[PDB]
Write a protein that binds this ligand. Structure first.
Ligand SMILES: [Co+2]
Ligand SMILES: [Co+2]
Ligand SMILES: [Co+2]
Ligand SMILES: [Co+2]
Length: 254
């Protein structure tokens, strides 16, 4: 009767496809919902159309669409809802709820914490550089800053400086240029990203480049599908499925 339609962003790099698919499959066993399908916005199938239609043939009357996204931007606001409306127009009897990206959640702050500790370097009063992809949509910068504020307050770090790969400032290269110094403060670099690929690889080169000036800089792995990221995402899934007040009812918002 009830369905979950998971939507990942999709990748063309084989490794990212496998990581995202494996994560969503391991999500299925935590949700007591009889119909559950995975799908991806782009570059990777099953498509949103395919997964939605799969939900319908297994008899779903209600579909809770939950996006696997760290942050809220054009993908969350437009692309996914547009695909949802396109496929859902063909099934007006199917009720739809639409969840939020993980966004500002204490669990993701815990994921950043475990990535920092994994480096094995003392963390007290240390600087953290939180690199998000970035977007021209201000909600992205706002949410990464909110995540930075929660981490800053919860762990006795010096500060957490959000910066971005593209589209909005400060660019991580500006911070890096300001980090050529070497002041004895240990620098953790945490990529606030779900997948590896070229941008993760360029940051890797940049962390070596930065380390050439200031040896007290250490790049952690990107957060990825950390268990605490998984906890936060399952919260998103459960709240979309519960829909206890109808607040996630999907008004066709392309
Ligand atoms: Co995209
Ligand atoms: Co599990
Ligand atoms: Co459009
Ligand atoms: Co923990």
């Amino acid at each position: 009767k009830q369905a979950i339609l998971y939507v990942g962003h999709g990748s063309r790099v084989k490794k990212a496809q496998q990581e995202a698919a494996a994560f969503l499959e391991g999500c299925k066993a935590h949700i007591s919902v009889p119909v559950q399908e995975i799908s991806f916005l782009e570059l990777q199938e099953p498509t949103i159309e395919t997964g939605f239609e799969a939900c319908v043939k297994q008899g779903a009357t209600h579909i809770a669409v939950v996006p696997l996204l760290l942050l809220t931007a054009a993908h969350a606001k437009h692309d996914i809802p547009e695909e949802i409306v396109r496929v859902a127009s063909r099934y007006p009897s199917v009720r739809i709820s639409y969840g939020k990206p993980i966004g500002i959640d204490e669990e993701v702050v815990k994921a950043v914490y475990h990535r920092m500790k994994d480096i094995g370097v003392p963390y007290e009063n240390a600087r953290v550089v939180l690199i998000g992809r970035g977007s021209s949509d201000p909600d992205v910068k706002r949410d990464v800053t909110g995540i930075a504020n929660l981490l800053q307050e919860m762990v006795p770090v010096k500060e957490v400086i959000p910066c971005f790969l593209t589209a909005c400032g400060p660019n991580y290269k500006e911070v890096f240029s300001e980090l050529e110094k070497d002041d004895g403060i240990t620098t953790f670099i945490v990529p606030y990203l779900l997948f590896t690929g070229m941008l993760m690889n360029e940051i890797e080169r940049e962390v070596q480049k930065l380390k050439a000036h200031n040896p007290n800089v250490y790049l952690s792995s990107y957060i990825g599908f950390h268990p605490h990221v998984k906890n936060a995402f399952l919260n998103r899934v459960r709240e979309t499925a519960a829909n206890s007040e109808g607040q996630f009812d999907f008004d066709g918002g392309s």
